[PDB]
Design an enzyme around this catalytic site. Sequence first.
Site, PDB file in Angstrom:
ATOM      1  N   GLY A 143       0.812  -1.200   0.000  1.00 51.38           N
ATOM      2  CA  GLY A 143       0.000   0.000   0.000  1.00 51.38           C
ATOM      3  C   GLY A 143       0.850   1.256   0.000  1.00 51.38           C
ATOM      4  O   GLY A 143       1.953   1.291   0.545  1.00 51.38           O
ATOM      5  N   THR A 179      -4.001  -6.373  -6.577  1.00 52.74           N
ATOM      6  CA  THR A 179      -4.219  -5.845  -7.916  1.00 52.74           C
ATOM      7  C   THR A 179      -3.241  -4.729  -8.258  1.00 52.74           C
ATOM      8  O   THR A 179      -3.430  -4.039  -9.266  1.00 52.74           O
ATOM      9  CB  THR A 179      -5.660  -5.347  -8.069  1.00 52.74           C
ATOM     10  OG1 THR A 179      -5.953  -4.394  -7.039  1.00 52.74           O
ATOM     11  CG2 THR A 179      -6.640  -6.509  -7.974  1.00 52.74           C
ATOM     12  N   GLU A 183       3.856  -2.898  -6.201  1.00 58.02           N
ATOM     13  CA  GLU A 183       4.147  -3.226  -4.813  1.00 58.02           C
ATOM     14  C   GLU A 183       5.609  -3.588  -4.569  1.00 58.02           C
ATOM     15  O   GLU A 183       6.113  -3.258  -3.481  1.00 58.02           O
ATOM     16  CB  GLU A 183       3.217  -4.350  -4.342  1.00 58.02           C
ATOM     17  CG  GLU A 183       1.753  -3.942  -4.332  1.00 58.02           C
ATOM     18  CD  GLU A 183       0.892  -4.881  -3.519  1.00 58.02           C
ATOM     19  OE1 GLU A 183      -0.170  -5.296  -4.018  1.00 58.02           O
ATOM     20  OE2 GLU A 183       1.278  -5.207  -2.379  1.00 58.02           O
ATOM     21  N   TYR A 224     -10.228 -11.251   2.974  1.00 56.56           N
ATOM     22  CA  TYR A 224      -9.386 -10.566   3.950  1.00 56.56           C
ATOM     23  C   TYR A 224      -9.819 -10.875   5.378  1.00 56.56           C
ATOM     24  O   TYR A 224      -8.988 -10.872   6.291  1.00 56.56           O
ATOM     25  CB  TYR A 224      -9.396  -9.058   3.695  1.00 56.56           C
ATOM     26  CG  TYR A 224      -8.465  -8.629   2.583  1.00 56.56           C
ATOM     27  CD1 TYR A 224      -7.242  -9.259   2.392  1.00 56.56           C
ATOM     28  CD2 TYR A 224      -8.813  -7.601   1.718  1.00 56.56           C
ATOM     29  CE1 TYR A 224      -6.388  -8.872   1.373  1.00 56.56           C
ATOM     30  CE2 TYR A 224      -7.968  -7.209   0.699  1.00 56.56           C
ATOM     31  CZ  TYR A 224      -6.760  -7.847   0.530  1.00 56.56           C
ATOM     32  OH  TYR A 224      -5.919  -7.454  -0.485  1.00 56.56           O
ATOM     33  N   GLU A 254      13.013  -7.287  25.256  1.00 53.85           N
ATOM     34  CA  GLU A 254      13.398  -8.693  25.284  1.00 53.85           C
ATOM     35  C   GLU A 254      13.254  -9.344  23.913  1.00 53.85           C
ATOM     36  O   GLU A 254      13.957 -10.316  23.613  1.00 53.85           O
ATOM     37  CB  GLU A 254      12.568  -9.434  26.332  1.00 53.85           C
ATOM     38  CG  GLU A 254      13.172 -10.741  26.795  1.00 53.85           C
ATOM     39  CD  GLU A 254      12.649 -11.178  28.152  1.00 53.85           C
ATOM     40  OE1 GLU A 254      11.922 -10.379  28.790  1.00 53.85           O
ATOM     41  OE2 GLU A 254      12.966 -12.316  28.572  1.00 53.85           O
TER      42      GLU A 254
HETATM   43  N1  LIG Z   1      -3.633  -9.784   5.105  1.00 53.82           N
HETATM   44  C1  LIG Z   1      -4.204  -8.672   4.650  1.00 53.82           C
HETATM   45  N2  LIG Z   1      -3.628  -7.981   3.604  1.00 53.82           N
HETATM   46  C2  LIG Z   1      -4.199  -6.849   3.137  1.00 53.82           C
HETATM   47  C3  LIG Z   1      -5.370  -6.368   3.701  1.00 53.82           C
HETATM   48  N3  LIG Z   1      -5.713  -5.235   3.043  1.00 53.82           N
HETATM   49  C4  LIG Z   1      -4.790  -4.995   2.083  1.00 53.82           C
HETATM   50  N4  LIG Z   1      -3.854  -5.993   2.123  1.00 53.82           N
HETATM   51  C5  LIG Z   1      -2.661  -6.112   1.270  1.00 53.82           C
HETATM   52  O1  LIG Z   1      -2.011  -4.854   1.244  1.00 53.82           O
HETATM   53  C6  LIG Z   1      -1.537  -4.559  -0.052  1.00 53.82           C
HETATM   54  C7  LIG Z   1      -2.202  -3.276  -0.537  1.00 53.82           C
HETATM   55  O2  LIG Z   1      -1.896  -2.223   0.347  1.00 53.82           O
HETATM   56  P1  LIG Z   1      -3.000  -1.471   1.252  1.00 53.82           P
HETATM   57  O3  LIG Z   1      -2.741  -1.660   2.730  1.00 53.82           O
HETATM   58  O4  LIG Z   1      -4.388  -1.949   0.898  1.00 53.82           O
HETATM   59  O5  LIG Z   1      -2.800   0.067   0.799  1.00 53.82           O
HETATM   60  P2  LIG Z   1      -2.821   1.286   1.854  1.00 53.82           P
HETATM   61  O6  LIG Z   1      -1.881   1.037   3.011  1.00 53.82           O
HETATM   62  O7  LIG Z   1      -4.227   1.523   2.351  1.00 53.82           O
HETATM   63  O8  LIG Z   1      -2.294   2.575   1.041  1.00 53.82           O
HETATM   64  P3  LIG Z   1      -3.117   3.281  -0.152  1.00 53.82           P
HETATM   65  O9  LIG Z   1      -2.366   3.085  -1.448  1.00 53.82           O
HETATM   66  O10 LIG Z   1      -3.218   4.756   0.155  1.00 53.82           O
HETATM   67  O11 LIG Z   1      -4.498   2.667  -0.258  1.00 53.82           O
HETATM   68  C8  LIG Z   1      -1.907  -5.735  -0.932  1.00 53.82           C
HETATM   69  O12 LIG Z   1      -0.795  -6.596  -1.004  1.00 53.82           O
HETATM   70  C9  LIG Z   1      -3.020  -6.418  -0.174  1.00 53.82           C
HETATM   71  O13 LIG Z   1      -3.032  -7.797  -0.448  1.00 53.82           O
HETATM   72  C10 LIG Z   1      -5.955  -7.057   4.756  1.00 53.82           C
HETATM   73  O14 LIG Z   1      -6.993  -6.638   5.268  1.00 53.82           O
HETATM   74  N5  LIG Z   1      -5.364  -8.210   5.231  1.00 53.82           N
END
Ligand SMILES: Nc1nc2c(ncn2[C@@H]2O[C@H](COP(=O)(O)OP(=O)(O)OP(=O)(O)O)[C@@H](O)[C@H]2O)c(=O)[nH]1
EC number: 3.6.5.-
Lengths: 438, 423, 352, 54
Positions: A143, A179, A183, A224, A254
């Site tokens: 993200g 998607t 990344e 998720y 620790e």
């Molecule tokens: N395990 C898990 N992975 C997540 C979840 N939500 C998003 N991801 C993973 O996080 C990645 C996408 O990043 P996000 O956390 O959704 O993006 P963000 O931190 O909100 O940042 P933005 O670009 O501003 O939306 C992808 O690889 C997703 O598979 C979740 O609820 N659980």
Amino acid sequence: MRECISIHVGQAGVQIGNACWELYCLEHGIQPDGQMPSDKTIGGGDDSFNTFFSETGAGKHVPRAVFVDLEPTVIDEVRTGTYRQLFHPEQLITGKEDAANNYARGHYTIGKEIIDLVLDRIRKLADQCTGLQGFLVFHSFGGGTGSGFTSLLMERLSVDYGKKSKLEFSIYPAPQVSTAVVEPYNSILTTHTTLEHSDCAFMVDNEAIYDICRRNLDIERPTYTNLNRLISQIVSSITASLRFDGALNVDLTEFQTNLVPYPRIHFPLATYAPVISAEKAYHEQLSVAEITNACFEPANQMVKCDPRHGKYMACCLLYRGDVVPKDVNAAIATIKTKRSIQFVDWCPTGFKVGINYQPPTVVPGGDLAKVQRAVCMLSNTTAIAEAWARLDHKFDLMYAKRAFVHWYVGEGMEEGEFSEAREDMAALEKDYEEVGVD
Amino acid sequence: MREIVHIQAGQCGNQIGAKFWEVISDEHGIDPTGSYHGDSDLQLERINVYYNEATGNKYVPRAILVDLEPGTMDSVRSGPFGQIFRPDNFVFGQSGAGNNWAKGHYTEGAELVDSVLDVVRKESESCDCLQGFQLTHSLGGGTGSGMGTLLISKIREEYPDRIMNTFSVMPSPKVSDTVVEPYNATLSVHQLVENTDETYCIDNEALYDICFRTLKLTTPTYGDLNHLVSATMSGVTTCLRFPGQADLRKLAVNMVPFPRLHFFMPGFAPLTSRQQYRALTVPELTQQMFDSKNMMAACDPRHGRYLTVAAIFRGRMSMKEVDEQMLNVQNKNSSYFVEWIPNNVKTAVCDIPPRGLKMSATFIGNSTAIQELFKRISEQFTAMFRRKAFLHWYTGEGMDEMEFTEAESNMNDLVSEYQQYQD
Amino acid sequence: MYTFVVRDENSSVYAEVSRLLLATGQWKRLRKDNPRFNLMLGERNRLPFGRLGHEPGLVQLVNYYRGADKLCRKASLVKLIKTSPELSESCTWFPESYVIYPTNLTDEREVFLAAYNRRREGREGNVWIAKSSAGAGILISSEASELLDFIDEQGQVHVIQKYLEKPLLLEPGHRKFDIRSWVLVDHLYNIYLYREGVLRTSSEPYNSANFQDKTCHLTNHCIQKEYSKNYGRYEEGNEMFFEEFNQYLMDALNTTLENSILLQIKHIIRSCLMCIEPAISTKHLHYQSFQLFGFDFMVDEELKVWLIEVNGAPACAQKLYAELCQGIVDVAISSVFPLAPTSIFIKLHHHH
Amino acid sequence: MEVIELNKCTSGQSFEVILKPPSDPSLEEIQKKLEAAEERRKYQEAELLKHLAE
Ligand SMILES: Nc1nc2c(ncn2[C@@H]2O[C@H](COP(=O)(O)OP(=O)(O)OP(=O)(O)O)[C@@H](O)[C@H]2O)c(=O)[nH]1
Ligand SMILES: Nc1ncnc2c1ncn2[C@@H]1O[C@H](COP(=O)(O)OP(=O)(O)CP(=O)(O)O)[C@@H](O)[C@H]1O
Ligand SMILES: Nc1nc2c(ncn2[C@@H]2O[C@H](COP(=O)(O)OP(=O)(O)O)[C@@H](O)[C@H]2O)c(=O)[nH]1
Ligand SMILES: O=C(Nc1ccccc1)Nc1cccnc1
Ligand SMILES: [Ca+2]
Ligand SMILES: [Ca+2]
Ligand SMILES: [Ca+2]
Ligand SMILES: [Mg+2]
Ligand SMILES: [Mg+2]
Ligand SMILES: [Mg+2]
């Protein structure tokens, strides 16, 4: 008693934070309205669970948590969800448009404008701490917020709380539930600028959580919610020592003492067993040796890799439930004579063992089944470097053509920050090789 | 609340834009009077993306109708959903553009552009958080082409950090109104290269061939071609209008590895001829969606390579079976996907299918094959410009031959840029 | 349609397997850097195992076992036999070997001299051979001073093992020889032995009073075809195959190849591969491995089989390329990726 | 196989088993990086507007 403040950044951090605090409450017997009948010290107390929860005069137990996201849709769930009552508005921060999966956008463009507000809210939680230990930061690598803004918050936290430990729970990117094509860029960018600010990082590869959900829970297409409920179980196992009476991993310091002998190599491998489907007719309960032996199966690791071709620097066994030391040692002896476990020569071949008698707590109606005993192994193998290699290779494929770089440069990032961050990873991979390979 | 402002300009732009609002209005449950009458909350979850909410629970599209002649927009207002559009949002002249890019961009268009921006500014001012803009238009005429690209240049000046997205109908000699269409198209393409983040290329020849060879329409009409564009526009915007596990800037970040190569080939499936009741399987939906005959840019994808691909599956179906068939097409034709963008094929599911379909699939490809389209336009352009044929229409509006030579070079540059990434 | 990549252009074995794979019309070859593959015919050195088994929806298979080098390295094999209880230090089928690091760099120098002085004192044959994996570089001598002084002049680890002074000599000729056995291990860790072996024979009479001329002591196909003057005299290309060798053992020794030799070879192969199975098995791994091995044996005049080394990237005799390569496609590749006998292997059953 | 530091309480216990013995940027500097990137955005936007003014 010393307090721990949890911080949830981005969608992944917030939703995983929602799932963890759901579990924390069920484990400590806290209702959705924050009330806790078993707490006989009303409006105060320095118990072990108070490291994660404050208390109001009205008897409400409020998580020591802050939720940060550059878009409100995910944090609005928390505001209107089951545990809406636990938090107050100061703890939830939401912008209006996210970072578009753009590290530069989350770190520079948008981060510069919201960092001081987040620090203000974190300071408010700190001012309630009589002896703050440090922070636990939940975020994703891919993200734009989880990567870009987290690395900025970690730089400032080191400035505003220099003597505090900072632990991470990071979501490694997996195509099966992503998607976003950029990344690998975001992951390497945030690992570079966060490396010297994090004392211990627990990486979880969505690919690993994904297959465990299909294989053990028999879920053809996990969501998720399925992923987060399983991840919060591992997180719970890791933070249990901080919230319950104990003598192992009793404070954040620790964790680095027991798991990280060399600073840059602060990414322990997590392995959890057993994961049994609740929909099962009824499962045969595994023994101490059986679940312990499962900790050396790749199928149960939070990051798919082969520890047989690495070296251990440390190894922790965290048990929950009906477990006694006599059985742990018996299983340990049996595993050494059957497993390929090679420690480094400058570390002892040993295992630190913790046992909490309360068995794992499962969310009602969830997917996981109640088990009588469970274990989480935290081992620091060079084998986890396989994860950096994979990620660095994908980075190299796109960066050779400068694909997508303009999106980052357009937000004020210099192109040279790519190569700078990539050489740091290249040096990190060389560190692992020096320690693990002959 | 990530609002999108919609603009439709010229004859082609307003007729295609009209059907678009007719199609998605049916999907969201908005009747021709703007009153909601659906039966699912998914219809209203993302309704504020394209619709403003007025008094009495009325939903008014966030669309601005623009033309240099009254004719087409008179038809829109009298159309079925004509009463749904804001009467203020009709901005038009009387002169016309005579299929002349110079008239739409420099003379006739310049006299009217400021009033159009007054309506745009009004719609944006009332947006909680404006994502960006989408423009529907043709490149072969005068208003949508010339004035449309003028509007984009002026919108980017006032909203420099918003996403600019267009649906652009490319001219074809087989479905042609005038011989100057290659002139107008080449001039517009350079504007889009500079001032759009995403452009959905729609070739009228692809639409014609699909209506003839696939849909089996003996004599296709403009109405028939627009039914395909309506369906496709609904498919590509499904990500925006319904809840799913995406904003314009996020779509751009994952579809555009290079700023200038932001021209997409859309696709749709099924495309059945009236055997229309037969259930369509996931493998069939996938095989057709990637078939060239199902694509609307009139370019053979097996001549270039895919930089990025985005597929959207609609309806109740096996998401496990969706992943299996998608991963089957990549792993069965990976020679047409560039190997230096890992995981450049993404897939999304939506539970609400289009009207009258158990399940559909929409294809968004960023393929280097799009260069064949620009090549055609360039050849048709040079065939006339080398003889300065028909230039007097444009020089009489103040343009110089130099501006044509530069547009010729700019497009040939674009083709060479696609060519390097194809090897 | 299955897909595979080729990342070792020098492998004669998998050059044929790739040729056979494409001849089926159901296997497509991709560029060596395309990650969307089902099968990888990987490189010899630094094969990136860590990047395998991470492609959604792709079952991926590689023609090398990560960690098999413990068996296919001169010093590695020695350390493996001496430290593994399954093989024990008292291993009866492996010559007394010692790992010796050149003095310009644990090391078994003193342990070697102790056993060397014991033989010198007991009037016993004290002829050792010093070799290494960095050779085409071998020295045979009965003086420990020459063996050790030869390793120090080099810069890589070496191994000194007992030289078989009483090798079985083929007649006519009075000539030495070794035996090459090809072994295939599939993803399920079934150990398949190719029914066809090859004896790489020395075309020079064995001379026990002159280890200086190493043409009659080293049965390598390249040494005999370069420094031997009787190459191709008794058998074509100094390659006697099992049919002829078995017929010889009957006419001369009144025994068979199965009884006198093959049982020991099969026992040796199982012991070696079963030992490292827990360390290299891909049973519960996110990807699958298979690999072809080349075992080299020596036979003494007592008809006792000894293990010389194990090759991890072996070649094959010209006459057996088609049969063996086809066999690899059958049990190693098609067993994981089926297509739309009388097996040529010998399954060595064992306990996993 | 030695066990050391056995700690017991009401909610569990912990111990250590040994099988074999062995053999930042200041606040000022963070603000400069942030403002430097903000300056590069402003410059690029200016060139865009300069382009549009021409
Ligand atoms: N395990 C898990 N992975 C997540 C979840 N939500 C998003 N991801 C993973 O996080 C990645 C996408 O990043 P996000 O956390 O959704 O993006 P963000 O931190 O909100 O940042 P933005 O670009 O501003 O939306 C992808 O690889 C997703 O598979 C979740 O609820 N659980
Ligand atoms: N201990 C020993 N006693 C007798 N002969 C030996 C020996 N060690 C090696 N040899 C001879 O050396 C030859 C093979 O040497 P070695 O196998 O160590 O080198 P190499 O690995 O380059 C050949 P390959 O890999 O093809 O088996 C055999 O033909 C054998 O006759
Ligand atoms: N698909 C489609 N194309 C059209 C339609 N009307 C015109 N065109 C095409 O658009 C070009 C003419 O542009 P037009 O919209 O009439 O010019 P404008 O009114 O001045 O903007 C020609 O290439 C036509 O083929 C329509 O309704 N549908
Ligand atoms: O022949 C003309 N143009 C031309 C010819 C060749 C090359 C380039 C340009 N123009 C013309 C002809 C007759 C009347 N008026 C104008
Ligand atoms: Ca209390
Ligand atoms: Ca610090
Ligand atoms: Ca006028
Ligand atoms: Mg987000
Ligand atoms: Mg017209
Ligand atoms: Mg060799």
